[PDB]
Design a protein around this nucleic acid. Sequence first.
RNA 1: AAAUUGCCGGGAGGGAAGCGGAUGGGGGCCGGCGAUGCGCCCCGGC
RNA 2: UAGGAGGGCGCGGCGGCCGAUGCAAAACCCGGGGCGCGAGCCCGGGCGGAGCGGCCGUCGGUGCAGAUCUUGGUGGUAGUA
Lengths: 142, 101, 126, 48, 50, 106, 186
Amino acid sequence: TTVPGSLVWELVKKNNCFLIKQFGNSNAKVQFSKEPNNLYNVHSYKFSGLANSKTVAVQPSAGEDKAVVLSTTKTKKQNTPAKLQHKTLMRKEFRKMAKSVKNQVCDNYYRPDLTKPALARLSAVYRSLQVSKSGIKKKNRQ
Amino acid sequence: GRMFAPTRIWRKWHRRVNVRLRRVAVASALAATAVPAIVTARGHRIESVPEFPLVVSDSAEGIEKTAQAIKVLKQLGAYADAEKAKDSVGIRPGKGKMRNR
Amino acid sequence: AVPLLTRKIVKKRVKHFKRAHSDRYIGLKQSWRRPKGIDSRVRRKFKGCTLMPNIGYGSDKKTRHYLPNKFKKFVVHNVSELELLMMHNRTYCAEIAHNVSTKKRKDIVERAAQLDIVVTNKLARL
Amino acid sequence: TARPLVSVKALDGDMATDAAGVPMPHVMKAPIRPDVITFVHRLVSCNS
Amino acid sequence: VIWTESAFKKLDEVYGSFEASSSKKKGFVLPRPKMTNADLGRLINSDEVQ
Amino acid sequence: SKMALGIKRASRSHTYHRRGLWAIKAKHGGALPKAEKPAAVAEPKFYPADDVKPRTVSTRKPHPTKLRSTITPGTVLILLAGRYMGKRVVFLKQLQSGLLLITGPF
Amino acid sequence: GIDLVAGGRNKRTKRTAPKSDDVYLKLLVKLYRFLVRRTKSQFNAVILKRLFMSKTNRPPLSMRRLVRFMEGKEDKIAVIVGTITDDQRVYEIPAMKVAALRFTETARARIVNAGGECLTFDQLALRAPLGQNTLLLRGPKNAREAVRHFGKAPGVPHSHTKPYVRSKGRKFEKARGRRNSRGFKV
RNA sequence: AAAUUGCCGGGAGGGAAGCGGAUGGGGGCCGGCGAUGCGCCCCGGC
RNA sequence: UAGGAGGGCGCGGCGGCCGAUGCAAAACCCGGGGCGCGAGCCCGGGCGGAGCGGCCGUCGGUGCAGAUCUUGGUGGUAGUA
Ligand SMILES: [Mg+2]
Ligand SMILES: [Mg+2]
Ligand SMILES: [Mg+2]
Ligand SMILES: [Mg+2]
Ligand SMILES: [Mg+2]
Ligand SMILES: [Mg+2]
Ligand SMILES: [Mg+2]
Ligand SMILES: [Mg+2]
Ligand SMILES: [Mg+2]
Ligand SMILES: [Mg+2]
Ligand SMILES: [Mg+2]
């Protein structure tokens, strides 16, 4: 982002290739953004994976089990896309993995914005991997 | 019968824009490409491209074949983008698919 | 897979707003069109004539667009457009788009069952 | 007396050189302007 | 856009700078923005404003 | 005396007495005790996406239902609903949940 | 019911956000929403309410008049929510510091070579968040050529409104109603 | 496709039918139509 | 009411973006389930057997209940005169 985060937001807020909007421009409008480096996949300036210098992505990994990728952008290497993302493939237990994500997101003051959301996506991703391994045992409707 | 207000050849098919406004627009078209974030948001697959705004040596100018051109785009990170372009090709839906498009 | 909604959905009117006179004629569809007549007792709002929509019949803002599921729906065409609902499955509900193959519906529903995303079309086309 | 330096990429089968970065152009730093771009693109596209 | 070195090194000889008659194109200087630095972060968070 | 009771309860001094801030000036020397920082569990098993809200251990302590004036231990009631309607019973004692406790006798 | 005109709701209307969808000017609008909200500076409120303008409520202000308005007040920073266009009818101009939405490349060269400072509003919001030492100037609104054609009617007496005529000449609105020798003098 | 017609099953009819607001009775229909899980805790291995 | 303005729904293209499609597209039918105050929209079932959408920008031969409206079809009239 040569131009600042706010200007990239103001430039991509209305149509961006990662945005899925349905139900029209009325009060019914549903907006999600589907870029990898967005946590809640909410289209807003807090979360946006394009309008920001500092973003935290947490993805279930390519073909391999129980391995979660945590990546954060590097603030200084913005104009070098191949070398913009710091990824780490952690297969440790949940508690250790969450300690690491706090280390990388909140405790270094990288971006405390996403201290909670990144751990929420970590929870959801980790259990998605669990169930992709075991299968449905709970229905979780109660 | 007719149609109401039948179209006529002397509609305003071409519009004019100030020459300086074309120049302003093309400068602000250039200035937006030098941003990886907007090049991405515009839809291009740029995740292995080495640096923006990307530049190659002039020895690229001397090639002749498209095998060589794809060889060139492998070194850069844009052959993913060429692949997107080539695998997205399809028949234009609607009355476009019969008007020579 | 358990709804976030904690606010009972009350509707001020369930019956539809059919076009006035759609009953006597067959060419007139049921879709509402406001009577613009000058002697139209519908427009003059005599008691006993088909009610027009107002804004007063609006529904509550936090209880708007929730199916009886108590989820807001979202139409997904494929697994990629599904995996963006992991952190909303307590308020959003994925529906598979009406023109997908059953081969791809099996994939969507497979993925949804594990990501724990409520769906209303996991018994569609099978 | 300092502007950013854009690194070139050579290819395979390239002669070694003592070259440096190409300095960044100003037109690559001009304002980014979407209302003008959509205006002008609407009118330039009508012209064919 | 993928630039070759020959093109990229003559962009500035085509477009010029914030200088009269810099360009190859007569009657044009690069547009100047309505803010030199649009980082509302540093505006709203710098010492002077805060 | 509902409203006289309201004021007598509402006095600041009588609220001091009722909350019993004396005997809280007893234990911690000649002053009101400090409070501290519980909840040092630091072991969340799972992180919800929705903003989390804990279980309500309800701190509101409702009044007891008032047994009617015309009810005395020993009063012959009249049941009115359920399988023993019309049955005349004898009231033993209005128990701790609020419900009456009656007997036929059987 | 109750006795009110339009239910008492405001029938006047003002801009509350610019119609221009210029990204930099929306960013300025954000910045000054924040400044007016947290800062209470009436000057910033005025800058705001003047970002919410047209271009015909923001006429250019030229160097001749700007120098008129800053003779002898050069520890105070000029603020024009508008445009600054130069003037060859001026010869010596003070080394002067001015904030404005735009500078014509001749006006900005003029000022810079006078040795002053050519600010934008983002620079201004730093060194005058409350508008210390500032000189708020507007341009001449009723100077536009269209403004002539307004007022009471061109042909009612005691009114000097310009009529809409497709050319000045003798044959174009000079005969009856413009002289006693044909009819009457307006 | 619709207006229009035939058969099959059902519904109702003291000089119109149709429509709006109430529910009541019939049908036709919905399992994201409606749950079975959470903590502690003891093994027995994973 | 006449009238005005704002925000939206819908149709057919064009420049881009996201995709669906012989495991069944478009179109059409339903006592199917919904969403919206509303234009409308989403899903299910069926026939159907080859193409189609959604979003941003932009455009136009774009929204029907009337015009003794145009064309085509079909009723009662009527198994009657
Ligand atoms: Mg014809
Ligand atoms: Mg009347
Ligand atoms: Mg009232
Ligand atoms: Mg006179
Ligand atoms: Mg029919
Ligand atoms: Mg019958
Ligand atoms: Mg009725
Ligand atoms: Mg009923
Ligand atoms: Mg027409
Ligand atoms: Mg056409
Ligand atoms: Mg009609």
